[PDB]
Amino acid sequence: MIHELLLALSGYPGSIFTWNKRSGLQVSQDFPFLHPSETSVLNRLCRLGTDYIRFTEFIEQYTLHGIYLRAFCTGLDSVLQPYRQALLDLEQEFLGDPHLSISHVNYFLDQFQLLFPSVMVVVEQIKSQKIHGCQILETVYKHSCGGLPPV
Amino acid sequence: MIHELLLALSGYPGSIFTWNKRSGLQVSQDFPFLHPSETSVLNRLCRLGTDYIRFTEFIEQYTLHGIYLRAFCTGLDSVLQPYRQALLDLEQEFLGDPHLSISHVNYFLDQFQLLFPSVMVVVEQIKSQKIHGCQILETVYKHSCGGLPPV
Amino acid sequence: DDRVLVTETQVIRETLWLLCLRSVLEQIAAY
Amino acid sequence: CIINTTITLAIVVDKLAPRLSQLKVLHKVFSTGVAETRNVVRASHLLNTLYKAILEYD
């Protein structure tokens, strides 16, 4: 189930983690093998997966036109690189000792959980206001004076 | 019954070891399984539990105010640390050989039985005379010139 | 009245995830 | 240490004493950072609550 999840957090949905076009990633229903209390933390964990999927779908779509939009997505993958790299690691730690639970996996994301949310509305302002041209170099700058150090 | 007692000496009273708000910890009445002569040593053993409970209840309550009262309780837990640590050990010795009786358990406390009593009236003088301010640094000092090496 | 009759160690694992039985749990719940 | 020594309820609690103490403070420090509309009063009243709450613990 661990390697099952680490793919769901990568952009591949399956039977355990269904995909909905409006809401986002979420667990289907109660599962007998697992506990009924975990059905929550996963839903808290998917609030992160939905961000990466809606990210990479937009990144590929390139959608509006202009070089400053092309380069924004070109750079948007660079900030998103430590997310992937930190996800490849989780499998290595689980390959060593088979006593690690979802608690530790949820704990490992830590920084990504408080970063994506603030870098989600920056994309939404673009696709909802047709920000064409060099005006992006301000719409991203007006959000660069944020307090959150990571952002 | 051993692990039952080692919790009663920790601050958790139960059916065998009832709790009274005035007197303190004490055994309820005669028990058929155990001998009728032990009903005494336990009562001698509880004279120690009553001290720890009345200690930790005061420690939590913080009651009067002032930093010198906050720090006194902050330090009061440090001297009370070897009591807890020496109690965790009793379970380990009983986990090894199942031939140890209450006699050995009573014997293990030894030092705590002659320490708490002398460090009980120091608290009572505070809560009964409203010792406010730096005057604590003498009321504790006037009792620091005691003969008992442990104290 | 029916009850689930959980084991003992299972409770500590559950408590870690959150981080007389109805009494002791009620305190940790407050945390 | 649970999957790999005996461990029960009364032990994990007392082991977590210096944490369940530090946690209770945050329930009172944050309570004044959540009970509140302008962006300049929500940030001033928060930052001033800390400097007041520290002088209480000195």
Swiss-Prot record, chains A, B:
Tissue expression, as annotated, is: Ubiquitously expressed.
Q: Where in the cell is it found?
A: Cytoplasm, Cytoskeleton, Microtubule organizing center, Centrosome
Function, as annotated, reads: Component of the gamma-tubulin ring complex (gTuRC) which mediates microtubule nucleation. The gTuRC regulates the minus-end nucleation of alpha-beta tubulin heterodimers that grow into microtubule protafilaments, a critical step in centrosome duplication and spindle formation.
Associated disorder is: Microcephaly and chorioretinopathy, autosomal recessive, 3: A disorder characterized by congenital microcephaly and chorioretinal dysplasia associated with poor vision and nystagmus. Variable ocular anomalies include microphthalmia, retinal folding, retinal detachment, optic nerve hypoplasia, absence of retinal vessels, round areas of chorioretinal atrophy, and attenuated electroretinogram. Most patients have mild developmental delay and mild learning difficulties.
The text of the family note is: Belongs to the TUBGCP family.
Subunit and interaction comment: Component of the gamma-tubulin ring complex (gTuRC) consisting of TUBGCP2, TUBGCP3, TUBGCP4, TUBGCP5 and TUBGCP6 and gamma-tubulin TUBG1 or TUBG2. TUBGCP2, TUBGCP3, TUBGCP4, TUBGCP5 and TUBGCP6 assemble in a 5:5:2:1:1 stoichiometry; each is associated with a gamma-tubulin, thereby arranging 14 gamma-tubulins in a helical manner. Gamma-tubulin at the first position is blocked by TUBGCP3 at the last position, allowing 13 protafilaments to grow into a microtubule.
Question: Mind telling me what this protein is named?
Answer: Gamma-tubulin complex component 4
Q: What is the source species?
A: Homo sapiens (Human)
Q: Gene name, please?
A: TUBGCP4
| Full protein: residues contained | 1 to 168 of 667
UniProtKB/Swiss-Prot annotation, chain D:
Subcellular location, in the record's words?
Answer: Cytoplasm, Cytoskeleton, Microtubule organizing center, Centrosome
The name this protein carries in UniProt is: Gamma-tubulin complex component 5
Quaternary structure per UniProt? Component of the gamma-tubulin ring complex (gTuRC) consisting of TUBGCP2, TUBGCP3, TUBGCP4, TUBGCP5 and TUBGCP6 and gamma-tubulin TUBG1 or TUBG2. TUBGCP2, TUBGCP3, TUBGCP4, TUBGCP5 and TUBGCP6 assemble in a 5:5:2:1:1 stoichiometry; each is associated with a gamma-tubulin, thereby arranging 14 gamma-tubulins in a helical manner. Gamma-tubulin at the first position is blocked by TUBGCP3 at the last position, allowing 13 protafilaments to grow into a microtubule.
Provide the function of this protein. Answer: Component of the gamma-tubulin ring complex (gTuRC) which mediates microtubule nucleation. The gTuRC regulates the minus-end nucleation of alpha-beta tubulin heterodimers that grow into microtubule protafilaments, a critical step in centrosome duplication and spindle formation.
The Swiss-Prot or TrEMBL record describes its family as follows: Belongs to the TUBGCP family.
**Listed transmembrane segments:** none
Location of this fragment in the whole protein: 385 to 448 of 1024
| Domain of life the protein comes from | Eukaryota
Q: In which tissues is it expressed?
A: Widely expressed, with highest levels in heart and skeletal muscle and moderate levels in brain.
Organism whose genome encodes this protein: Homo sapiens (Human)
